[PDB]
């Protein structure tokens, strides 16, 4: 709590808290040699069903090159398949691992993130974060 | 509209910040990802790629590519390492300083005002307060 003495801007706070989330993800996901970054790519493909690398790049806001490397690794692991249109989609086993991740990682991440918060502080934080998104 | 977990909300709000950064930074052909790298070097003054990878939590390979691009643009320079010699320090050129220095205005003003457009002043103070409480 040099943080409460000091005035840190909101954008910086959002960044730091997102770093903390990603470190916690990386820890809980570690039992599948899947990174937080790979996890997000898988989730994005899951919700889109099928999606261009070009379209995926745009949804994720990351470099096209860096994403091709990500997609290479995820195909080698059998979690993603490349189809003729290019279009990337989840394998049946990448669907499994997406499913296992979410069940493995939720609750735990929520409880570690909110450990210092009151129940109503959690509800307020969630409320106000939603208000930023419109 | 529904009950979205905190972790997910943090992600979505962080995505939104990055998209706004990418828009405002577009007049330099500099990405939010690049801008973060420059800021990290700024505050470290000089830093290993290995130490930088750790501070940024990105792949070493992907960071070497980032650093290649920023050297070609003249915002970062590679130096001989005093302790290693087979290795290098990166630091900002004066141009890279001028650009990373713009992080005060960008994150604190423009980006800040777009993020908080739907918030009351006290709602901003509360959101900041509670985000700080997650960090310990």
From Swiss-Prot, chain A:
Tell me a Gene Ontology molecular-function term this record carries: DNA-binding transcription factor activity
Q: Which pairs are disulfide-linked?
A: none
Q: Which organism is it from?
A: Escherichia coli (strain K12)
The Gene Ontology biological process annotation of the record reads: cellular response to antibiotic; negative regulation of DNA-templated transcription; regulation of DNA-templated transcription; response to heat; response to stress
Q: What does this protein do?
A: Repressor of the marRAB operon which is involved in the activation of both antibiotic resistance and oxidative stress genes. Binds to the marO operator/promoter site.
Give the record's keywords alphabetically.
Antibiotic resistance, DNA-binding, Repressor, Transcription, Transcription regulation
- What protein name does the entry list? Multiple antibiotic resistance protein MarR
Q: Which SMART domains match?
A: HTH_MARR (SM00347)
Outline the extent of the HTH marR-type domain: 7-134
Per its UniProt record, what Pfam families does this chain match?
MarR
